[PDB]
């Protein structure tokens, strides 16, 4: 099931960059194999620098489920969540995170050198016991290729 | 001017608690002593765990100026911004953060031990360049008092 939802996040990244909503980032929030939210980066469409794919997905899932905690849900991110998005995942009480590409793949096409210490376990104050899986193999290769594939179809931000 | 805007952020915190919008947190974004945004936590109002005072203020400031970067603006937070909000502050390119109370003040009254390494200077992957001022004296007293005064006047989240 991990491959299915990570693939959906990747295709959301492509869709969002193709419609000009924002950058090539997708996020899918699922509740026991039922997709609650399927979103991409909306920074350009919303004129909102916080409207990352993950934050957008959290907003939508919480509004749809009428609760501010997503402890029964998991989030699939096309790319490794940034510090803001990882903090949002923590505040959401999401119980699992699966992400496709490492943040370096986005940094390679010019994005901010902006990586969540708590995700990589390199913090003094911020810790995390969130279950975190970095995908490998097939879906991971596809997810990493997103940034080379889309790098001239959108504005950096 | 720092004290005036920090006190307005604290006033926003009290205001938001009174109307049941969310927790005792406020944020004011200014552009050369002109207020661009004045908000409080809206997590309960919006059913959105990302709607912290800082994130709400960034969204509204960027909507008012019709741009996704706030490089000429400064932000005043009644309480030390969390990892999510400090990440959003990074992404917004706000050039200066002035915050009132230490995160320990919010932790003492029930909020998560959820502290941003990059704000306190212990981040490894996240490196902030923005100027950061922790308020002293009367401003610190105001901001810390927020959490004693609003104890059990709001629903925790
Ligand atoms: O988690 C993220 N979600 C996004 O939508 C997004 N859009 C851009 N970025 C930037 O990509 C880099 C790798 O996380 C960081 O510079 C992010 O700010 C994003 N990070
Ligand atoms: O930066 C923040 N803005 C808020 O609105 C807010 N509301 C609650 N909290 C929590 O307070 C603690 C200290 O920052 C952390 O547990 C935050 O999640 C907040 N942090
Ligand atoms: Zn992000
Ligand atoms: Zn916050």
All domains in chain A, ordered by first residue? 1-150 (3.40.140.10)
Closest residue (by CA) to atom 13 of ligand 2?
B103
Does the annotation list B52 as a binding residue? yes
CB atoms within 10 A of CB B114: 19
B114 and chain A in contact, CB less than 8 A: yes
DSSP states of B39-64: EE--HHHHT-TT--HHHHHHHHHHHH
| Nearest residue to B75 via CA among B9, B141, B146 | B9
- State the closest ligand 1 atom to the C-alpha of A54, by its place in the atom list counted from 1: 3
- Between chains, do B90 and A84 touch, taking CB under 8 Å as contact? yes
Q: Hey, of A125, A154, A155, A157, which one would you mutate to test binding to chain B, going by the most B CBs within 10 A of its CB?
A: A125
Q: What angle do CA B15, B26, B52 make, to 5 degrees?
A: 110
Ligand 1 neighbour A37 (Cβ under 6 A): no
Ligand 2 neighbour B100 (Cβ under 6 A): no
E strands, chain A, are 26-31, 34-40, 74-79, 96-101, 131-134
Which residues neighbour B38 within 8 Å (Cβ) at sequence distance 6 or greater?
A: B8, B9, B12, B26, B27, B28, B29, B57
Taken in order B10, B15, B16, B17, the sign of the CA dihedral is positive
Q: Tell me which of B12, B54, B74, B80 is the catalytic residue.
A: B54
Question: Resolution of the experimental model in angstroms, please?
Answer: 2.2
Ligand 2 center to A106 CA (angstroms):
28
Does the annotation list A85 as a binding residue? yes
Find residues 121-140 of chain A whose CB sits inside 8 Å of chain B: 122-126
Task: Compute the residue count for chain B.
Answer: 157
- Between chains, do B92 and A43 touch, taking CB under 8 Å as contact? no
Ligand 2 neighbour B106 (Cβ under 6 A): yes
What was the structure determination method? X-ray
Exposure class string for B6-31: b at 16+ Cβ within 10 A, else e: bbbbbbbbbebbeeebbbbbbbbbbe
Which residues neighbour A26 within 8 Å (Cβ) at sequence distance 6 or greater?
A: A8, A9, A10, A11, A12, A13, A14, A15, A16, A38, A39, A40, A41, A53, A77, A78
A32 and chain B in contact, CB less than 8 A: no
How far is it, in rounded angstroms, from Cα B128 to Cα B86? 9
How far is it, in rounded angstroms, from Cα A155 to Cα A105? 17
Nearest to A68 among B49, B87, B114 (CB): B49
Ligand 2 neighbour B27 (Cβ under 6 A): no
Task: Give Cα separations from A141 to A12, A63, A71, A109, A138 (angstroms).
Answer: 16, 33, 29, 16, 5
Strand order in the sheet with B26-31: B34-40, B26-31, B74-79, B96-101, B131-134
Does the annotation list A73 as a binding residue? no
Q: Which helix (H) or strand (E) holds B77?
A: strand B74-79
Residue with tokens 């400031």: B61
| Nearest residue to B81 via CA among B115, B57, B45 | B115
Ligand 4 center to B102 CA (angstroms):
13
Residue A40 token pair: 């991409």
- Between chains, do B63 and A47 touch, taking CB under 8 Å as contact? yes
């Amino acid at each position: 099931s991990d491959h299915k939802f990570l693939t959906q996040a990747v295709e959301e990244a492509y869709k969002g960059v193709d419609c000009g909503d924002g950058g090539p980032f997708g996020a899918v929030i699922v509740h026991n194999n039922e997709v609650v939210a399927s979103c991409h980066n909306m920074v350009l469409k919303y004129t909102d620098p916080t409207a990352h794919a993950e934050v957008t997905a959290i907003r939508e899932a919480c509004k749809k489920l009428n609760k501010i905690e997503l402890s029964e849900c998991e989030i699939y991110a096309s790319c490794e969540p940034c510090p803001m998005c990882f903090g949002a995942i923590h505040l959401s009480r999401l119980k699992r995170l699966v992400y496709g590409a490492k943040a370096e793949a986005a940094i390679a096409i010019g994005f901010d050198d902006f990586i969540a210490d708590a995700l990589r376990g390199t913090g003094v104050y911020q810790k995390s016991s969130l279950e975190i899986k970095k995908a490998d193999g097939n879906g991971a290769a596809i997810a990493e290729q997103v940034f080379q594939n889309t790098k001239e179809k959108f504005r950096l931000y």
